[PDB]
């Protein structure tokens, strides 16, 4: 059968992350910052028409 998929994504994976760390630090005067401004505008149109039709003589 018919399958239709529309994706509009903002994905952030593994950002400023640690995994399997075995480190030694003494002083950390500073960190990390994430700043996101999410202002999209969506005026899209999705249309689907299914069905048989006969005679047209406008």
Ligand X SMILES: Cc1ccc2nc(-c3ccc(/N=N/c4c(S(=O)(=O)O)cc5cc(S(=O)(=O)O)ccc5c4O)cc3)sc2c1
Residue closest to ligand X (Cβ): 32
- Among candidate residues 4, 3, 1, the one with its CA nearest the CA of residue 46: 4
Q: Which is nearer to ligand X, 16 or 47 (CB)?
A: 16
Cα–Cα distances (Å) from 24 to 15, 21, 28, 32, in that order, read: 21, 9, 11, 19
Tell me which of a copy of itself, ligand X, none is bound by residue 57, counting a contact when its beta carbon lies within the kind-specific cut-off of 5 to 8 angstroms.
a copy of itself
Tell me which of a copy of itself, ligand X, none is bound by residue 28, counting a contact when its beta carbon lies within the kind-specific cut-off of 5 to 8 angstroms.
a copy of itself
Give contact residues for a copy of itself (rule: CB under 8 A): 1-58
């Amino acid at each position: 059968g018919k399958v239709q998929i529309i994706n509009k994504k903002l994905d952030l994976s593994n950002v400023q992350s640690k995994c399997g760390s075995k480190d030694n630090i003494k002083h950390v005067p500073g960190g990390g910052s994430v700043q996101i401004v999410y202002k999209p505008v969506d005026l899209s149109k999705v249309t689907s028409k299914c069905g048989s039709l006969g005679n047209i003589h406008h």
